[PDB]
Write a protein that binds this ligand. Sequence first.
Ligand SMILES: [Mg+2]
Ligand SMILES: [Zn+2]
Ligand SMILES: [Zn+2]
Lengths: 50, 1166, 470
Amino acid sequence: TPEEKLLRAIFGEKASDVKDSSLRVPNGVSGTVIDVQVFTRDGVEKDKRA
Amino acid sequence: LKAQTKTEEFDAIKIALASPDMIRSWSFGEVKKPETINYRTFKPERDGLFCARIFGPVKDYECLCGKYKRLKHRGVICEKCGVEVTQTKVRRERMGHIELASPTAHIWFLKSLPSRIGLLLDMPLRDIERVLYFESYVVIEGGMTNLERQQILTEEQYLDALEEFGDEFDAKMGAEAIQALLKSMDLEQECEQLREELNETNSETKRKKLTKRIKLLEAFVQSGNKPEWMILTVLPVLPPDLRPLVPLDGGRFATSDLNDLYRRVINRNNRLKRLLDLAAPDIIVRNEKRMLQEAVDALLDNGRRGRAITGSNKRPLKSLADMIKGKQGRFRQNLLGKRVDYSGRSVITVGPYLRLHQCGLPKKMALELFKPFIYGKLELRGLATTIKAAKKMVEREEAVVWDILDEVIREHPVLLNRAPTLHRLGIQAFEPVLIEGKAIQLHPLVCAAYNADFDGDQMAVHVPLTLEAQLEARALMMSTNNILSPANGEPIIVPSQDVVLGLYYMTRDCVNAKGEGMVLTGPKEAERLYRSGLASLHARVKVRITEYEKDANGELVAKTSLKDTTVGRAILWMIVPKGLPYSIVNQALGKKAISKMLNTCYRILGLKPTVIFADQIMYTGFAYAARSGASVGIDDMVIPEKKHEIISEAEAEVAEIQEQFQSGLVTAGERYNKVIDIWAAANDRVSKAMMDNLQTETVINRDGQEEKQVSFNSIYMMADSGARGSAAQIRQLAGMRGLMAKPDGSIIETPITANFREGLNVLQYFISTHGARKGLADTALKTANSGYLTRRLVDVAQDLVVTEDDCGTHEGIMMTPVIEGGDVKEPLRDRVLGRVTAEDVLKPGTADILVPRNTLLHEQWCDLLEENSVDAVKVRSVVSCDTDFGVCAHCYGRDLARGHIINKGEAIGVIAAQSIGEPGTQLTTGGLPRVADLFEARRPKEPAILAEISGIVSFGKETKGKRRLVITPVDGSDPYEEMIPKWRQLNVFEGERVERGDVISDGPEAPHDILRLRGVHAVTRYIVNEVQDVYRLQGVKINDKHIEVIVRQMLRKATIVNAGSSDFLEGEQVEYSRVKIANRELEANGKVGATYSRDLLGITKASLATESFISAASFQETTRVLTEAAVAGKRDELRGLKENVIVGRLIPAGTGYAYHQDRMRRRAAG
Amino acid sequence: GRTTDPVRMYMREMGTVELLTREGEIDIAKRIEDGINQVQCSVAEYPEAITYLLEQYDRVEAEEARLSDLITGFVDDPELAREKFAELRAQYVVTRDTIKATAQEEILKLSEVFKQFRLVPKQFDYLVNSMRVMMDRVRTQERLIMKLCVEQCKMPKKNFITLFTGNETSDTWFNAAIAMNKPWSEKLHDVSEEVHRALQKLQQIEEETGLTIEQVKDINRRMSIGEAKARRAKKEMVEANLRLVISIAKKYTNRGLQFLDLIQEGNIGLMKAVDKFEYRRGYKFSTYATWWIRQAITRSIADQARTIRIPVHMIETINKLNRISRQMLQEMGREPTPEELAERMLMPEDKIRKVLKIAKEPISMETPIGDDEDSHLGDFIEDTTLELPLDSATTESLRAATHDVLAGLTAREAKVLRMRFGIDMNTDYTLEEVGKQFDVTRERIRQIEAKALRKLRHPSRSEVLRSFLD
Ligand SMILES: [Mg+2]
Ligand SMILES: [Zn+2]
Ligand SMILES: [Zn+2]
């Protein structure tokens, strides 16, 4: 909208074409990570970590 | 002043049939295609169930084609595809329509039990359906030839009749036929003719139906509805977002079933149109018409014909009627419940440190709950630049926010609620106290009102957002403002268990203990003596005390003396405020006395002192109980030494009777009864052994050899004080427990000879199991029964609210003590307390008025009545109140959580229903089902009969199945002769005179009778006394008031006898009627006034009639109510609670009563 | 009795109709032939029907139309068409001048050549419609002239039809019959002005249509008769053949359409089958109609049976995938990989994912989940199109923010910045527009903007607006 456009104009920020869907630990629960698994479609290139 | 056009704040509501043009008014376009979305670009296909042109833009302020995307362009209809760019919200609003080829019946008016199309046309249902399916021809406007107007013909018959008469005769078939019938119908002419026919012939059969039908007809005329509208020309389509196509995860879609239905109706409809333009044979187009009828029926209300199933899924698709009805019995989404913001819940804990006016609230909970307040307060003081920054602050949980939360919490109450809300105390307001940890802390004294154990029960919290809610919570729902049950004036704040064991152990006395006999200046040095270990907590001691009595005029007198008391009572006295006498703490202080302490304190010093007193009592109770070191060991349970001997003798008895059965001296059944009797007697013996031993066996020494007092044994103190445990359970612990019963209801003749202190073997335990399971099952069921009962009750009362101040009638019921068969099963003082006198009452001598006409009788007035011997007081009741459409506060009583007279505008029906309903769990023909039977007015199974009229009676005729009874009044005419079946043993004396309402036989009697023969006061007395018998037998305290309001709601309707304005036999409101004959007695006709006869309707029956249809649609059967109202064009004015709750505005009671009143008088006025 | 369930009140209603004998089929078809040919011949006897075809072909060669919009072809290409139309025009230009007894022999032939033309159904329809509308036009004057005498001026209809039949145009009946001194004679004078002026269109019809009011009724009456005969026979045939439709639709049951829907669409198919059938080819009507009915069924199911409509080739594609998945299910012993059926199929083969996804049917929003309780799937679908209050508050706040900071610059910098963006104003303005509104134009304005942005950049100003960007 107009004032957001003015805001971006002054502060020169590129508002991303991407939104953050990242999985974050649910509120209030705290613990230590004991494992991670990565399932991939057969034929898609496995990423670095996986 | 120009009235208005656009939105005002509306009053009432109207419902009626819909014209084709009226249906077109709502419609913003015709949906011409079954298509939903394009299948790739998911945009709506134009002219389909989902359409941007007809309904609205897919996204906010944006055209479908995308040409006008700017928020500036608004009222613009796009030149490409007309879509007015406006918020997508309007896709939740805008309706549509479909123009049907052939006419179609509306299933609601075809299949409603009294079929509307049917009885409007005076035509049977099966005929109408037979005509709709093209299974026969029906005549319309037959003219004069051979034939009736509504007559039905077959193929061959229609042909022959057509060959004979070409014109001046008419017949059609299918929907068009029925519509032709309804349109041709002239209601007025029918009215005239039916009035004439009514007048001419005398037969009950004829004129009953005649008058019923004429009434129906003129009603439908006055409605504004024209019959044709029962046949659908145009079919409205529901807005898209109310039946959405919205996407899911995995790219999957999900949609309402209505689409599947609507689509069908469209397809077939369109197909039918095609079949017209292709000139198809009749057999085809007919089938298509029937199919269209079926599709429309399935759309509107599914299940009244075929129950169509949804695509690929067996489960029947949900139709619009099923959308309206909802489910979980009768619940309309206000009724079942609604999710609410600013709320929470969790496991609850104790928190004895709390004052009675507060509660422990978990920090995190209070943080998330008050979040907007916190945001606003953070930038109010300028600790946060903007709202966003405030969010980031509290989300970071910066240290500074906790203090701000301490600010927003202070004066700002929160509502606490428990799971089974029964009476109004199920929700109470508290002051939040910020507490670390995730559990809610709840004041112990309140634990009674919630019926909340600590075993993991959870409670919910609600935040009172608006200012009015803060003040409502603080001045109404506040904890300290309800100290008394609305059911009875007794304190609900009564100390529960630990505390009462504390005060019990505190004031009690043993025979010999440290400090016995000495004397002390005052309670201070008594406590000083105790804590230092010099003097025992319980010892007989004289101490000087100063008590107070306010018995002067509003003024506290003081007096000092040497009281013979104990150390404990002395220490405890420090707590007792002001004008209470020392007499109250000088006793043993059981759970019963400790209650009357608070009660007297309330009726004397007022509210605040009672509150602070109660708090102190709790604190000291816990403290001293903790000091006492009370415990429970295995040796705390003492078995009688004589048990085994009792068992042995009683065991000899059974083998004696057995030996008698072996020799035939006694029959099997008589044997059984005998053995069972001896075992029962044995059980009683052991019980009264262990009771003596456990109770008095402490045998101790003071200065001499011996003496014996009541035991200091733990479990005994527990059971005696009223803390926990009772003689029955104690009896189960030490002495043998009972004789159990096999499932069929018989009782096993070999009881449980062991107990819990000893071991139970295999058999005894297995037999105990049944008793256990039946216990759990029965209680868990009685919960449901109670709930159902409260439901029926609030349904029958509800809208009853205190409206006027004083109706000013001398009328009332005579209040006497209940005096049952023994001495006084309940006194006069309890029955008349807090009520108001109907007229001034005498001393034994007169021209001396103790209580002057109508005055609230409080404790002092009742005690003044008690000083004198007065045995009888006439008292105003809610049943006799002259006020119409409510109760005057003057007729109700004072009763509330406060001792003052009932406020103007409090809704009494609801609290009455709740007051009757809450204790219902504790109830066990007799019992809770007996109560339900009572309030339902149900005629018993084998009832008695009361004399129809006074005077000498005799027996007449002979045995036909009835031997007639002939009554002979002294002066008046004889002709009353009642047919009494003679195989029922009579009572009435063949040679004696019987008053009307005497016993002509035995057995219980239907209260319809009692109302008719004995009278209104008589019947209300019967109901109240019987239901009170049921409750009081269980030890339940319920004031007669609530029951009386329920009764008043039961008798709301009556049936006229005489005439001169309205119809003869009509059941109708006595409010309406009495206000009409009070109006008629003067002016009008000089007096044309009509006599009525009061009627008795059961609660579930009385709840049926409600002026407001929106209210009825809630708890009754929705479909029928909606139809039956829609025909008469009934106009709901609201005015009640349920309806206003549904529509979502202020309740016409309590705080809201000021608004509605101000609105109610503005209405129908200048 | 009638158990309702409209399948039954159909099944029993059609079951009355007796099956056709092999001879009866030929009888009925013959009846059809008779009927239609009557309306065709009746069309051939209309002058306007000819002249119209002429005026249309003159428009075809003038490039105002195409040969496809007039003829579907004759009994029997553009050249052959040109010369056939030349034949038509020829017989027309002879028959026209011979109207002076002998003419009939050619007027009979004029029909014949016109009968060689097989018209587009639309064109034929336009013709017949025009005829019946012309008959409406005749009826207007007949009923006007009737009511102006009988109802208004009080004349019996018994004597009204005497001088009517055979003429109904000239003044023999109107001006020579009012002097007859009948009780109804002198009464005819009041309305005379209104009758004789309305006689204009009446006598005009015999000019336009080239037929006396006599023939105009006869011709299209015969046409009406023919049409009636036709429809009668065809209907008869369809009603006879419903059983076949029922037998065929029992194959297609669970494809996602109701039984009666199926049999109705199939019935439409059978109607088309009767419409297009020719018994002269010796092809049995049963096996000929089967194809049409099956066609209606399948073609309908493809079109309307989905909550989401999909094109035909897509559907067929999906089915094609299913076929492979069947063999390959046990053949692979597990199931073909998601890309396995892809190589088996012609097209780019990554389309498996898209096609397989879009093919799925939406789940009933009333689908029950858990407890059997009133929780139903739709109750769990949240509104994602809404806007959080925690945001809206910040919108309303940001307004106060930028509005505050816009009071911090010179009124012209404020005007230029409120202009350059949509702030509290409709749309927003191009930097040239801003120049014309300010009278100071081009590069100049942009400069101010920069400095404006510059003043808000270094913080006293910046501290309030900076907290807005997360
Ligand atoms: Mg519990
Ligand atoms: Zn557009
Ligand atoms: Zn009253």
